Design a protein around this ligand. Structure first.
Ligand SMILES: [Cl-]
Ligand SMILES: [Cl-]
Ligand SMILES: [Cl-]
Ligand SMILES: [Cl-]
Lengths: 236, 234, 225, 233, 233, 234, 234, 234
C-alpha cells in the first residue's frame, strides 16, 4: 500500500499501488484509487491506505450516499473543502462503528476539482481532520512512503508540468516496489488537467506495461551510469 | 539518527549521522560511531540508534570494562560472535536497570585477528543477526529514505571506496528528506586485515568532497530525469 | 473446516466441507424472486452456531433488522458484524464468515466477515474468499480462476481445491455442501450435497490426479547446472 | 521461508527458499540450507525456519563447536540420531539464552556406517524421524506446496524427479504466499556419496526453473480445460 | 513554528517561519502568514501556530465566508475588535468539530479604515488580548529564544525598518537554537494608513539581505564578547 | 530557576540562579548549587531544578550517606558514572517515597582523580545522559531565553573565563525575560585537575563585575544593532 | 495585579499596578486604570483584575458603546448605580461569550453630576456592592499585603493627599512581598465636584517622589523597631 | 490561624495564634504550638494549620508513639531530617484514614537535636517538606500574608532572638487587625541555640501587658512616621 498525489499549477497527478494486506496470510490485489465524477462539473479522486475493511466501507457508503439527493454527498457538496469535511465525518462514522486502539485506522487522500474552483488536494487522518496541499507542500503520500520520498523532493515542485510529475510518481513507485514487498503491482494512475473535468487519463499499470518497463530500466541504468562516473573518493 | 554498515569482500564501510533527539526541545549533535581498537589485533565498531541515555550507558559500560582484565570485555572476547553476545547482554543489563521508551538498536562490525570480517545487528531484546553475502549491510534509525540507493548499487563485491560513495549518497537522500537526520557525519573505512582506524573521518557541512559528491549526484539525477523518453501511458 | 466462495460476472459458486473438531457450514436465507443469501462458517463452532442461530431466529421478527428485510448486501454485511460484536460483548473463539448472494435491485456481492466484526468485499481484482484450512486449496484457484471464469469451471476449480484439501488435512472431510448461483436467478436449485459416493466428484478427482501425474512424467529432464 | 527435505531409497533432495523476515519492515535474503561435511565420512544438511536470530545462533554455535574435539559436535556424533539430540539441545540453549524466539529445523544426510536419516526438530528441542511411508518433511509456509508432494512423491521416486517435485512445490508456494521468495538453495545427495557437489543456487534468471514453472503451469491449464463437463445432478 | 507581530506608531511589522509539524515523519513547509485585503479600505494579517489541520480550517472557513456578503465575515466587520471576536468564534467552531491536541494560537493584526492599527492574540479557547503601547508585540509558536532581543531593542516608538530588523534577528537566534523553526520566512511591513500588501516578502536561505544581517549580527556579537573586560569574580 | 553547566577541555563552568517557587504565594531564595568535595581527590557539583522538596531531600540524603562509609556514597564512588547512577537512584528513591508533581532535574559535574572531567544530566526517571565535545553543556529549568548566546560563542575549547562570561550573559537575558529566574546567583569555576572549590561565588544584585558585564553587554547589543546594514528587502 | 480605590469626604483616590500574566510565561505590562470622562459632567474610573482577555473585552465594549447614543452607555446613564448595573451586565456578557478562569473583579468609582462620589466593587457574577463610610475602600487582586496599612491609617475623613500616601505605602509593601505585582503604577486623585482627570499619573521606577516615599517609610519603620522597649515576656 | 517560625544564627523564634474553625458555627480556641521535649538532649516544636481534626490526630499519634521505644518516634530519631520524614508519614497516615482537600494540613517543625544545628521544616499535606536555610530563614502557615511585609523588611538570618520575637509579635498584631480568622490568646516560644529548654514559652492573653505595650507603641510609631512624610509631589 503506497499512494501518492500531486497538486500542480496545471493539474493533479495520482498514483496508487494495489498490494493489500487482508489477513495474516491474505495478501491480495485491491483498487486503491476511486473516482467520483460529474462530467463538466466535478472530478474527485479518493486514494486509500490502512485498514482495508475501513476504507472499503468509507468508499461504499460515499458511493451509496451519492444516490440520495436528500443527503449531503460528494455530488452536491459545494466545494472540495466540504468534500474533505464529509470524508472526515465518514471516517469517524466507520471507525466508531467497527470499534469496541489503532487497528481500524486509515488515511485517505482526496484530490480534484469542482467547477467554480481551482485544484484542491487533502490528506484525511484517522481522527477525521485533514490538511490541504499548498504550493510549499504540493504533494501528499500515504502508506509505505519513505522509500519513494527522496526522488519527489529532488524533482517535483508546484510548477512541474503534469507529465513529469507522473514520471516522478512512477519512479517513486519503482524505488518503493524494489525496497519493500508490502507495495506491489498492478498500479492505478491518473492525470487530471486543470478545468478538464475529465477521467480519460486513467490507467492500470501491470508488469507487462511497455512504458513502465522502459522508464524503470532507463532510470536504473541512468543511475548506475552516474554512479560509476562519480569522481574518486577523497575523504582525507 | 541514521546509521549504516556494510560488510564486503575487501572490507567494511560505516556511516553515522549525529543529529539526536535527547528531549523534544533538546535536539543536538552526538557521535554515533565508537571505536574499540587494539592495533594489530582487533578493530571493532559500534553504531548507536534509539534512546540516547540507553546507548551512552551501554557504550560507557563497555568502555569502562575494557579496562578490567578479569571480566569479559570487548578487548578479550575471542570472536566477533562473542562480541555480539556481550553487546546483547549489556543491552539487557542497561534497559532493565533504567526502567519501549528506553529501547536502542546497535550495529557491531570489524575484525578480530584469526577470523574474517563480521558485522552484526543487535536488537533491543538482546538477540542479534549477522550480515552475509546475500544481505551484506544493516541500517538503524531512520533508514528507508536511504535504502533504495543501497539496493540499487551495493553488493558483497563492491570495492570499499564505492561502498562508501554509496553510503554518502544514502545519507544525502536522508538528509534532504527527513529533518531528524543531520550533519556532521562520522564515517569509517576498514580495509580487510588492516586492523587500522586510520580512515576514520568526521564529515561537516564544509567538507569539500561531500559537497562535491552531493552536487554531482544531484545534477546527475536531474539530467537523467530530463532526458527520459516522453510519457506514454496510452 | 474449509469454505470457499467465488464472485464472477455471471454468478456465484460456494463450497464448504462439513467435518468438525457433521454440522452444516453453508446456510441459506431465501426469498424466491427477491433475494438469495449464503452464509459460510469457519472457526469456533460455539461462536458460529450462536451467530447463525440468532440470525435465523431474528428472520422470524419483521420489526427487527434481519437477513430477510435488509435493503442491500452491504447492510447484510453490517448486520452480520453487529451480531459478531453482539456475541463478543456478551461473552479463543475466533470465527470467520463469508456472505454472498444477491438482493433484487443490486448485483452479485460477496463479503468476508472477520472475528472483530468488520469486513471486506470481493472485487474484480480479488474475486474469491477462503476461510478455515485454506492454504492447501489456494494454488489451483490462483492458477485457473479469474473474475470472468464461467460458473461451471469455477465450481470445478472449487472441487479440485477441496480435493487437495481433503487429501492433505484430516480435519476437513466429506460430505460437501456446494452451490451454484446464476446471476439474477434467486434460485437454490443448484444446491447439492456431495458425499463419498458422488459419481462426478469421484470422476474429476481421478481425472485430475491422473493428468497431473501425466504432466509430471512428461516434464523435461532435470538440468540444474 | 519454506524448506523441504526428501528422504528416498537412492538419496536425499533438499530445497529452501531465502525470503526472510528479520524485523519490522526488514525482509531480506538469507541462506536457509547449511552444510556439515566430512569428505568420505559424513554429509549433514541443516535447514532453518522461524526466528532468524535464533537459527543463526544455532548454526554459528554448531560450526564453532565443530572446531573443538573436546566437545560433542556434528563432526564427532556417532549416528544421525545423536546429531538430532545435539541439535535439540542447541535449540533449547539458544532459545533460553535469547529469552517468538522459536524455530523449526530439518536435519538430513548420511554418516558413514549408517543409512540415510532425516529429522524434523521442533522448538521444544524434540524431534521426529522420516520413514518410507512419510518420506519428506517441510518447515515454514508449507501447506501450499504439500498436495503436489503427496500426489507424486514416494520412497522409491528417483532423485531427479524428487527434486522436480520440490521445484513445483516451491512454485505453487512462491505464487500463493509472498512471504516465500527467490533465490533458492537446493541440493541432491546421492546415497553413499558423501558429496556436496550437487548444490545449487537458483535465481530468477535460472533457465530450467523458468522452464519447469512455465511447463507445469501450461500443463495444469490444459488438464483443466480438457476436463469432462460439470455434472452435479 | 514561530510568528511575531509588532504594533508600532508608524505601522505594523510581521514575521513568520514555515517549518511545520504535520505528522511525526511529516515536517514540511507551510506558509504561516495569510492576508485579508480590501484596497483602500482594510488590510488584515493572520498568523498561525499549533495544530495545522486546525489552523488551515480556520483560515479556509474565513476565506470562504468572505465570498458570502449575507454573512458576518472579515470583509464586513466594522472594527478590528469585531474581527477578533469573529476569529475566536471560528476557532471554537473548528475545535468542536474536529474533536489540547487540536489547539492553535493566532495573531491578528492590521487596519480597518476609520480606525488605527490594532493587534490581537487569539487563544485556543477563542478569547483574545490586544496589544497596547505597554505591550506592543505578540509571539506565537517557539517564542522564548527570540524574546530577549525584542525586549531589548523594540518600543512603541521604534521606526518600522528597525522593527523589521528586530524581527529578523529574533528569527535568526530562533533558527540557531531550535530546529522546529525553519526557513523560508514570510515577513511583512504594514505602514500606517496604507492598506497595502506590497511590502510582503519571502525570505529563503539564499536571500541576500537576510544573509547580510545575520552575518553582521553574528560578527558584531562575537566582537562584543571578545572586548568584554576580563572576569573578576 | 535556571541552571547551566559547561564541560570544556580546561575545566568546568557552573551557574545557578536562586529564585524558587516553593508554594502558591511563596516564591523565595533557595540555593541550587551544592558541592561534594574531597580535597586532592574529588570535586563534584550538583545543580537542582524542579520540586524544591524533592531536590532538597535528594541533597540531604546524599549528604547524610556521605557520612556513612558502609554504604555507597558520593565520597566512595569510583567514577563520575557510578555517581550519576547513584544520583539517578536517589532521584527515584525520593520521588517514590513522596508520591509529575514531585519531579526534578539535576546536573552533576566535576572530577574524580584518575579520570577526566565529566558532566551529566539526570532525568526524573533516574536515567541520564553525558556531555561530550559535540554537546559540551547542559541547561535545566527556564533555559530557552539563555541558550542562543551559548550556541553562539560556546565551544568545547572556549577558555574557562569566557565560558563563565557566556554563562553570566545567558543568566542576564533570562533575568530580563522571565520573572521565575532571579538573583542572587551561585556560580563556580572548576579548573581541570585542580580538585579545588576555591572559585565558588555568590553574585548578588550588588556584585560589581556582574553589574559591569550586564550594562556593558546591553550597551554593546544596542551599538551593533545600530551599525547593522540598513534594511533593503526590495 | 493589585488595585485599590478609596472614597473619602473630599474625593476619591485610585491606584493600580500593571504587572499582568496574560498566559504562562507571558508576564508583561498592561494598564489597569481606564477613564471615562465627560468634562464638567462626569468622571468614571474603572480598575481591572483577573483574566486580561475578559477585562480588556469589558473595557473595549464599554468604550465602543459610549460612541453609540442609541444604546445605554457610561455617558448617558443617570447615576453611578446605573453605571454599576451596566458594568455588571457587560461582565456577564463577556464571560458568557468567551465560555471559573474567565472571571474578573472590577472597581468603579467617580461622580456623575447631580449626585456625590460613588464607588462600586463588581463581582464576576455581575452583582456588586457599594462603599460606605464604614467600609470606605475596596481592593482587588493581590490585596492582603497592603491591607494592614490602610486599616491603620485610612478613614472616611482622611484628606486626599494623605489617602494617596496610604495607597502608595500599600503598593510598596505589596511590591516588596509578591512578584505578581509590579511597576509601573497608574494613579489618580479625584477631587469632589471637580469632574477632572488633571490628576492622572504614571509612576515609574525612576519616579522621584515614589522613590522618596518608599525610602522614607522604610527607613522610618526600621527606626521605630529599634526604639521599641526590650523584650520581656516573663 | 497564623503560625510563624524563624530559624536564626542564635536560635529559633515561634509564634502562633489560637483561633480555630472547627465547624461553620464552631470557631474556638485551640493550641497550635506543641512540644516534644527531652531536657539536655532535644527540643522539637510542632506548629499546626488547616483541618483541626487532622492536626490533632497527628500530634496525638506522635505523642502516643513517643511512649513506645520499639517504634520510630520523635524521641528516638537521630536528626531533625528524620523527624520531618516521620511527620510526613504521619500526615499521609492521618489523611488517608480520615478520607476513607478537606482533610489537609500544613505543619511547621523546628528545633534542635543534640549533635546537630538548628533545623526548621515546613511540612505539606502530601507529606513532603522543605527546610529553612540562610536564604529563607522563616516559614509561615495559615493566614500569613497580612504579616509577611514586616518580616521581610525586618528579619534576617543574623537577627538576634529578641528582635525576632518582636518582629513576630508585630506580624501577629497586623494580622489581628486585618483578618478575623486570627485571634488571641497567643502561644510563643524562644529557643536559644544549644539550650534544649522550654522555659521561654509564653501564653500571651488579651491582658498581657507587654504585648499590649508593643502593639500601642508600634501603632503610634507608624502613625507618627506617616504624619511627617513629605507632601504629595506626583
Ligand atoms: Cl444512510
Ligand atoms: Cl562492573
Ligand atoms: Cl535510488
Ligand atoms: Cl454611608
Amino acid at each position: 500500500t503506497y499512494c501518492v498525489a500531486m497538486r500542480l499549477s496545471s493539474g493533479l497527478a495520482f498514483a496508487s499501488d494495489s498490494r493489500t494486506n487482508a489477513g495474516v496470510d491474505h495478501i491480495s490485489t485491491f483498487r486503491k484509487l476511486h473516482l467520483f465524477q460529474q462530467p463538466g462539473e466535478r472530478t474527485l479522486v479518493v486514494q486509500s491506505a490502512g485498514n482495508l475493511a475501513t476504507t472499503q466501507s468509507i468508499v461504499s457508503l460515499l458511493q451509496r450516499r451519492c444516490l440520495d439527493p436528500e443527503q449531503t454527498n460528494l455530488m452536491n457538496v459545494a466545494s472540495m473543502y466540504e468534500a474533505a469535511t464529509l470524508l472526515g465525518e465518514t471516517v469517524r462514522e466507520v471507525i466508531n462503528r467497527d470499534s469496541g486502539g489503532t487497528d481500524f485506522n486509515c488515511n485517505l487522500l482526496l484530490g480534484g476539482q469542482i467547477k467554480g474552483e481551482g485544484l484542491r488536494l487533502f490528506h484525511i487522518y484517522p481522527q477525521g481532520n485533514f490538511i490541504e496541499a499548498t504550493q510549499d507542500t504540493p504533494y501528499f503520500q500515504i502508506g509505505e512512503s519513505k522509500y519513494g520520498k527522496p526522488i519527489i523532493d529532488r524533482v517535483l515542485s508546484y510548477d512541474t508540468p503534469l507529465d513529469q510529475a507522473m514520471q516522478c510518481a512512477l519512479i517513486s513507485m519503482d524505488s518503493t516496489l524494489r525496497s519493500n514487498l508490502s507495495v506491489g503491482l498492478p498500479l492505478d494512475v491518473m492525470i487530471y488537467p486543470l478545468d478538464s473535468f475529465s477521467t480519460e487519463q486513467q490507467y492500470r499499470i501491470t508488469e507487462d506495461h511497455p512504458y513502465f518497463m522502459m522508464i524503470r530500466k532507463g532510470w536504473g541504468e541512468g543511475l548506475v551510469s552516474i554512479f560509476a562516473q562519480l569522481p574518486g573518493l577523497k575523504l582525507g
